[PDB]
Assembly symmetry: C3
Homo-oligomer: 445 residues x 3
C-alpha cells in the first residue's frame, strides 16, 4: 500500500491517504468452559506439610468458586450494554435448564465442539481447563477418605499450576464486574484464540486477517461472565467480525488558521472541524470522531462502527473545495491564535503565531526550516523534528509522497469587523449568512 | 422495581424511571496491616539447592520492603486529593510515635480488632498476613545460624505462597504511586472485605447492600499506602458509606431535534442538555453529568456525590413542560443535522436526517419499522436492533413499559431567519430573548 | 519550599504558587535484553512426574517465544507515535544485520554495558535474565538426550521462577500491542531502574531527582518491544530527561462568577479559562491544559512538554490585572449559575448561587462559615470541609499562607442587556468589542 499525503495551505488541513479498512460490523460469540469440581471441604486428621499445602490450594479453589458465584448473582449493567448484547443474549440462553447439559455433552470427549443452542445460534464451545478431572482423580483420595492420604510433591506443584488460571480469571472478573476488554490470555490464550479464529465460519482472508492482528482483535473483543451451574464455569468471548474490508480510508488533520496582524485583538481564526478517520462504507462514508476508536496496523485501520457517524460521500469535498455547495463544510472560529503543531502520517502541520519560534530540524544538520506566521507544512523527507515554542515533536519516519497544495488562506477572504469570531460549530455557509446579517445591520445605518 | 420509560417527541428526549439510589456521602476508613520481619540479609556457607531457593525468595522479600520504603519516603499528591482526605488523615495520624504500637498491641492475639486512634477515630484494624512469625520461626534457623540449616521442600513452597501477596501489593502500589482504586483482592480479599463490611458501624440493610454489590463497592473504594515502621506495613482502605438510599433516580437521554427541509442550510437544530443520571436527594436533585460516575446494578444506581451538581427539584419540569418558567430548561443549538441514535433503558431514540437509512428490526422478521426524517422512538417490545446509516445498535432487552408522549417538535415554533443557531449553552428563555433582540434589529428597519 | 495562594475575588480565580518545575524535554533510550534458548521441542520416553512438570513449563516458554514473534511481525502504530519515536528509531537500528551481535558481544561477560550503535547513539544495554544459560545447562540433559533424564525437584521450582518474568513480559506486551506505560517492575525492576539512572549521562542532581521519584519516572516512561532474533529478546526503555528544572510553577483555579439577582434569566456569568499548571520555561511560560499531564510530588511538578502550549510570560497578568492590554485575558460567558466549588492547594473557592446551601465546617466546631450568593474563598486554616448543596469536599491540609485579594466582581461592570452571554472562548477585549457593536445597534435606534 502506498501512503500519500496532501496539505491544503488554504484551510490549514492535511489528508493522509492509502489506508485500507477493517470495520467491525458483527460479533461472533463463543462459549469458553471450565469443568469444575463440586467437591465440598473435607477435614481429616492432617498435619504433614504436603497435606497442608494441598488444603491451602483447595481453599483458594473454593473461594474462587464462591466468588464467581456471588459475582454471578448480580451482574452489573455497562451503560445500556449494546456493545455486549450478543454475548449477553447467549448468557441468558445458557441460564435455561438443560442448556449447560447440552454443552456438557458436546464437550464430553473433546476440548472443542460446535453446539446448536436452543435459540438458533450455532456457537463454538471449548473446554480450556478440567479441574473436575484433576481434583476428583488426584485430590479426592487425599481428603475425601477418613484419614488423609499423603500426596507426592509433584501433585502439590501441579495443582498450584492448574488452579492458577482459575484464580486469575476470577481476579479479572472481580475487579471488572464480569466484563473484561481487552480479552486477556487468561481468558483466552493466543493458542486458543488462533484455533478459535481458524474454526470460525468466516472466509480464509478473514482468518488470515484476524490471525495476523490478534492483539487488535483482543483489544476489540469482550469476555462476559455467564454462569456457574452443575460443575461448569461458562463465559462468552465476543469476537469482532469485520464486515467492511479493504475500502479506502483516510485521516483528516486540522490546525488553526489565523490572520497574522501585529496588533492583538485584530486577528481572526478558523479551524476545520471533524478531524479523524474516514473510511468508504457501503456507498457512504463512516467517520470516526473519537481518537481512540481506531487502531492502525501497517496501512490497515481497525475501527468499530458503533462509534462512527455515517456521512454522505460528498463530505470528502471539504478536502478539495471547502466553499463547495454539495456539502456544508463545517468550521469553528475564534480569536485564539496560540501556536501549535500536528504530526501527520508523512509530515507536520505548523500553526505559528505571535512571537513563537517555529522550526524544523535534522538531527545532524540542525535547523533546516523556519516557519513564518501562519499555517504551514513540512514533509518528513529530511526532517526529523519540529519545534514549536518549548516543545519538540518527532516526525513519523514512514515512507510516502507528500503534496503541498498551495492556496490562499481562506481566512483572508473575511472582513474582520463582521466576522463571527466565537463560533463553536459553524458551517461555511452558516458563517456567510451570519455575515450577510451583520452586513444588513450596517447597511441600514 | 418496575422500570418505565417516557419518550417526549416534542423535545427528542427520554426519561428512564423506577431506579433506586445509593449515593456515597461518607467514608469508612480501616487499617490493614502486614506483620513484617526486620530481619537483615544473612550469609552462611550455602550451596544446596533448597537453601538457594530460600535465599532467592528472601531477596524478593527484602526488595519488596525497601521498595515500599522508598515509595513511602515521598508520596505523590493526586490532584488536590479530597476524595482520599479521610484515609490520608489516618495515615498522618499513624505517623505519630506510639500509634503503630497501639495497633500492634490490639492485633497481638487476634487478626481483627477495633482501635480508638489518638484523634478520636474508631478504626477497624486487621492483620491479614504474618511474615514476621513465619520468617522468624521457619526461616531464621536456616540463615541466621553460623552455617545454614537445610530446609525441607514444603517450606520453600510455603514461603513462595506467603510472600506472594506482599510482592503483588508492592507491585500495585509501585505503579500507582501508593493510591489504588478499585481495591484489588490482593489489597483486600473478598472474604476480608465481606468480614469488614459485616463488622462496620452501619445498619443491616447497608451491610446487605454492600455485601450484595462488592464489585461496585471495590470500584468505589481506595487503598492508600500509610507507613512502614517497626515491623509493620500499614495501609488504609477507604470504603464508601451510602448516606442516600432508595430515593427515586431517573436517567435523561437527549438527541438532536432538527427541522427536515430538503435544502441544506435551511435547517435548524436543538438539543436538550444535561443528559445523565438524576436522583432525589434531601429536598433537591443530585445530577451526575459524567457518564462513568454511576454504576447500575439491577434497578439500583451507585453514584459518588463528589461528582454531582445539586439542582432544584424543579429541574424535572424540563421533562414535562420545557417552556415552563419555574426552571430555565437548557438547550444547545446548531445546524448539524447528522443522524444518530441513543439506546435507552427500554427502547431507542432515533434522529434521522438527510438521506440516512434508519430502521428497526427483529432478528427473524426483518425490518419492522422505518423512521422518517425527524426524531422518533421505538420500544424494545418486538425490536432487537436499530440501524442508522452503517451502524447497528442492539436494544436493551429489559422488561418494562414505554410511553410515547406525542407532541409537536418544538423546533418548529422557531422562525429560522432569527433563530440563534450556534449556541453552545443556551436556555429556552435565553434563546427567546436573543430572538426578541434579533426581532428588534429587523423591526426598526 | 513555601506554598502560597492568592484568591482574586474580582475574577473568582486562585493561584497556588511556590512549586518547582521538572519538565520533560528529552528521552534517554536503553536496551533491555533477555538471553533466550533457541531450543526446539524434544520428546523422549517420559512419564515421571518431574519430567512432566519440566515439559509443561517448557511449553509455556516456547509459547512465550512464539507469541513475542507474532507480536513482532506486525507492530501497531500508536497515533502518529512521536512520543515514542526515539525508542522506535532504536528498534529500527536493532533490526540491522550485525546489530544484535554487537549487543550480544558487549553483554557476553557482564550484565550491563555501554554500546555505540551504528547510528551514533550511545545506549546503555542490560541483560536482565539469562534463559539460554539455564535451559542449555540444566534443561537440555533432561529432554535433548535419547531417553529423558530425571530432574531434581529444585530444578522444577527454579525454572518456574526464572521463566515467570518472561511470561509476564509477554503478557503485558500482548495486551498493549508492544508499547507499555507506565513501565512495570517486570519490564524493569526498581533495582534495575535505579542502577540505570545511576549509570546515565546526567548530572548528579538529576540522578537524585529521578531516584527519589521513581514512581513518577515510571509513569512517564515507555517500554517498546524491539526484536526477537538470534537468541535475543530486546526491548527499549525510554526514560524521561527533565531539561527544565526548578523554575517557578503555579496552578490556576477558576470558578463561575455570576451576578446574584433574584429573578432567573436576569443573571450573567463569566469564567476565566485556561485553568491548570503554568511553569516558567526559557523566557516563556509552558501551560498544561490537560489535568492528567502533571504529577505533583512535594512542591515539584513533573510535566511532559509534549502536552503543553508555549505562552508569552505576559499571560501571568491575567492574575494581577485581567483588563490589562499586554495580554488578552480569555473568558467564557454563560447564564448557567449552578453552584460549585474548587478545592485549591490551600483552601477552596465557592461559587454559590440560587438557593444552594454553601458552608465551611470544622470537624469538632461545626459550621464556621456560611457563603453568600457570589464567589468566595476560604483558607484551610481551621477549615476541614466545604459543603455545597448535597456535596461535601475535603480541604487539603497542606501548610501555607493564603491571601484574599478583595476586589469588585468584574461581572458587575457589564450591562446585562448587551452582555454576550453564550460565548465559549471569548477574550476580555473580544467581549468589549462585541458590546461596542451591540451598543451601535441600539445607538442608531
Ligand atoms: C449571502 O449573500 C450572498 C451574496 O448575495 C448570497 O449568494 C448568499 O446566498 C447569501 N446567503 C448565504 C447563507 O450565504
Ligand atoms: C420576549 O418577548 C415576549 C413577547 O412579549 C415576552 O413575553 C418575553 O418576556 C420577552 N423576553 C424574553 C427573555 O423572553
Ligand atoms: C470599544 O469602545 C471603547 C470606548 O471607546 C474603546 O476604548 C475600545 O477600544 C473599543 N473597542 C474594543 C475592541 O474594546
Amino acid at each position: 500500500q502506498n501512503i500519500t499525503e496532501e496539505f491544503y495551505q488554504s484551510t490549514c488541513s492535511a489528508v493522509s491517504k492509502g489506508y485500507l479498512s477493517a470495520l467491525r460490523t458483527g460479533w461472533y460469540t463463543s462459549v469458553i468452559t471450565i469443568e469444575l469440581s463440586n467437591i465440598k471441604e473435607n477435614k481429616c486428621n492432617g498435619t504433614d506439610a504436603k497435606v497442608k499445602l494441598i488444603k491451602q490450594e483447595l481453599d483458594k479453589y473454593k473461594n474462587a468458586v464462591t466468588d464467581l458465584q456471588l459475582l454471578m448473582q448480580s451482574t452489573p449493567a455497562t451503560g445500556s450494554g449494546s456493545a455486549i448484547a450478543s454475548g449477553v443474549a447467549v448468557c441468558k440462553v445458557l441460564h435455561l435448564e438443560g442448556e449447560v447439559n447440552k454443552i456438557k455433552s458436546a464437550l464430553l470427549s473433546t476440548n472443542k465442539a460446535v453446539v446448536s443452542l436452543s435459540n438458533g445460534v450455532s456457537v463454538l464451545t471449548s473446554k480450556v481447563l478440567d479441574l473436575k478431572n484433576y481434583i476428583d482423580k488426584q485430590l479426592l483420595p487425599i481428603v475425601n477418605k477418613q484419614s488423609c492420604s499423603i500426596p507426592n510433591i509433584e501433585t502439590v506443584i501441579e495443582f498450584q499450576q492448574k488452579n492458577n488460571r482459575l484464580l486469575e480469571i476470577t481476579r479479572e472478573f472481580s475487579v471488572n464486574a464480569g466484563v473484561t476488554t481487552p480479552v486477556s490470555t487468561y481468558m483466552l490464550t493466543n493458542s486458543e484464540l488462533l484455533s478459535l479464529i481458524n474454526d470460525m465460519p468466516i472466509t480464509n482472508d478473514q482468518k488470515k486477517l484476524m490471525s495476523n492482528n490478534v492483539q487488535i482483535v483482543r483489544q476489540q473483543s469482550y469476555s462476559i461472565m455467564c454462569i456457574i451451574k452443575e460443575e461448569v464455569l461458562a463465559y462468552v468471548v465476543q469476537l469482532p467480525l469485520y464486515g467492511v474490508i479493504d475500502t479506502p480510508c483516510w485521516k483528516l488533520h486540522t490546525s488553526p488558521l489565523c490572520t497574522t496582524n501585529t496588533k492583538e485583538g485584530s486577528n481572526i481564526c478558523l479551524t476545520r472541524t471533524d478531524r479523524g478517520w474516514y473510511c468508504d462504507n457501503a456507498g457512504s462514508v463512516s467517520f470516526f470522531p473519537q481518537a481512540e476508536t481506531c487502531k492502525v496496523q501497517s496501512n490497515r485501520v481497525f475501527c468499530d462502527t458503533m462509534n462512527s457517524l455515517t456521512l454522505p460521500s460528498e463530505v470528502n469535498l471539504c478536502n478539495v473545495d471547502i466553499f463547495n455547495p454539495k456539502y456544508d463544510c463545517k468550521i469553528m472560529t475564534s480569536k485564539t491564535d496560540v501556536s501549535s503543531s500536528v504530526i501527520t502520517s508523512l509530515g507536520a502541520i505548523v500553526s505559528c503565531y505571535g512571537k513563537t519560534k517555529c522550526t524544523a530540524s535534522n538531527k545532524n544538520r540542525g535547523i533546516i526550516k523556519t516557519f513564518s506566521n501562519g499555517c504551514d507544512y513540512v514533509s518528513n523527507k529530511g526532517v526529523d523534528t519540529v519545534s514549536v515554542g518549548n516543545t519538540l515533536y518527532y516526525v513519523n519516519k514512514q515512507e510516502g509522497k507528500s503534496l503541498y497544495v498551495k492556496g490562499e488562506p481562506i481566512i483572508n477572504f473575511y472582513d474582520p469587523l463582521v466576522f463571527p469570531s466565537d463560533e463553536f460549530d459553524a458551517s461555511i455557509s452558516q458563517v456567510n449568512e451570519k455575515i450577510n446579517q451583520s452586513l444588513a445591520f450596517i447597511r441600514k445605518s
